[model samples]
Target: HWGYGKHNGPEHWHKDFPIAKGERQSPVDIDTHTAKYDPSLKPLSVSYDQATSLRILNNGHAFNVEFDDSQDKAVLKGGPLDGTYRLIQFHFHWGSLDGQGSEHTVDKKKYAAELHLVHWNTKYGDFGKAVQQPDGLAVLGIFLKVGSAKPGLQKVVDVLDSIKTKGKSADFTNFDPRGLLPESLDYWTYPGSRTTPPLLECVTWIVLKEPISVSSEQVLKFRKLNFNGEGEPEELMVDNWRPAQPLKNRQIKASF
Candidate 1:
């Protein structure tokens, strides 16, 4: 829901799920027409080949992926972005296409889904030590909107049958998380907090305005994830999004 329903929807999930209270949230609406962001921010350089690993976790919430960081030493320079950050973990936020499921916002407008690509500071050796630093993390936000029935995501959608029932995972073997990314490298940058809990204020966010579209059929597959026990009726995961929060006093930057 862009705005409606019980769970009451997005707004309620963030309040109830302690695990989702501070994860640098997603699904933000991007309005280039009104954004006051500048074009001078430093660019982000990434090598998906070296920093991405996909591990399927049994976290009650949707698919929780643990990103491998053995090779994510990268740097950013100029203005407020002068530092090196390392890749950490990345997960997603979505809905059934009929209800709530988006994370980020621009002028308060929300999208359909937001993919978070998380990274920590490389200055302190590793993620554990880096999370303590003031500017120790970075997240690349990719928006997902339902449209045109594209096949770009079939690589991932095909495996849902294995993880369909709650607490299960299909053979996501040889799965490289980087392959799920959109082709566009341009983005919007800002200083923000985690959309999930602990709600850490240690993130430098980069939101990509260009989105990847999943078919309406594909979206339904996500809504089908269930947590019911072996004999109980499966529960449809219709609402998996957190509402957009206030930006506090933050300013976003454009990378195009």
Candidate 2:
């Protein structure tokens, strides 16, 4: 019951991953009214060497754009963090319909989609070993709204056809992760778990206040990526987002 499906979706995830019900669950609704204003938060520093972008893969989960994290090529610093974090990959979550798909909501309002840029702390040595620690990962959450076509995002949408099935991958380079960000660096920070299974309580979330735009047609193209591979019954890869979890014993800080 760990996968995104009718009988085994988010509601039943806690059956296997007991930590899903834990205090610091992710995809929490960020109520700006309740969020504390933290002027101490530093400006977000993002640096990416376009050459370090490796490839894109559809691992039966989401189409992840992998990066060469072996080197400190693309990394994020400052903004509710003490040290540097290297970019590992970036993935998306969306719904079957256009109205609701984003994992983290604002004031209980959902976006058309969400993009998670996953990174790991350099002090932790490696992502595999660090994932078990409390301060292992830092993910930048960018909400996607439906509007005029986003030229910067077209490159990603263009390759969706090649990676329509699970386990498919293609060369995806020359793109800078910085190109996909909004002009505003203001964000909300909190401690949370992975939206998917394993649900590790190791992520420090930095969710952007401003959203990037994607056309309605582009969102439909994303829906075509199948969750099932080869011979299995084709399941449209949509609505893969985990439900918003309870916010308990934690304070969401805003960098305004």
Candidate 3:
């Protein structure tokens, strides 16, 4: 049970999400104070309609998800996203069983967790092929902070007791994930890369400077899941966070 302080934290997750370590790796700690800043990258757009099939995958991480738009009608448009980018997958990053797990920092403050909504440019056909293109992917970052109230995040936590161990998962039959997004989508947009393996350098990052709040107790539940393997008993929630990296000549934009 780790909340994200282990050696295998975010810094080491690239071993699994190889795309996360690429030259354009994202969720990078954006330092506004030191940025040269470009004004061109402003106001990003995305699509999350009925045509979009958001599948929930339990990839040993914080409830992995893969979005499939092959069937219906959903697309990305406007701003840096000039054309439609089909929804691909979405996942999360956490910390060790203790505390202090986050990828982006606002004014140097880290949060409890980060959620990423991954998409691929339709101009390149599909998720697989678009991944190789220069502007192939877009990742939307949402920060979660622990608070006193249950917060809507508890909707996911309430079910944790049922899947209390690793590899243990259940379907959220009629759950609408968009319900989880914060009401306001105003965010900071920039050019970056995947935070996982393959570390592709074709991502447009839209990070929400605003954070959604969850109860501190709710955050503790994330660390309570088993880490040993599938079918193992529930363990303390501790290490699931990633370590921060250098900015590497990137500029961040705020959509105020």
- For each candidate in the order shown, give its overall lDDT on alpha carbons: 0.61, 0.90, 0.63
| Per-model RMSD to reference | 4.6, 1.1, 3.8
Model 2: CA > 4 A from native: none
For candidate 3, write residues 144-170 as lDDT tens digits.
Answer: 776665454565666666655546566
TM-score of each: 0.76, 0.97, 0.78
Across 16-133, the per-residue lDDT of candidate 2 in tens digits comes to: 9899899899989999899999878889888875437779899987999998888888899999887889999999999999889999999999999999999999998999876888
Q: Give the TM-score of candidate 1.
A: 0.76
Off by over 4 Å in 1: 1-34, 51-54, 73-81, 98-100, 149-152, 165-171, 227-233
Candidates arranged by TM-score, highest first: 2, 3, 1
Error of 3 at 250 (Å): 2.1
Give the winner by lDDT.
Answer: 2
Q: Candidate 1: lDDT over CA atoms? A: 0.61
lDDT of 1 by residue, 51-97 (tens): 44455543445666565567653333333456666556566777666
Q: Give the per-residue Cα lDDT of candidate 1 at 138.
A: 79
Clashes (N, CA, C under 3 Å) per candidate: 20, 0, 48
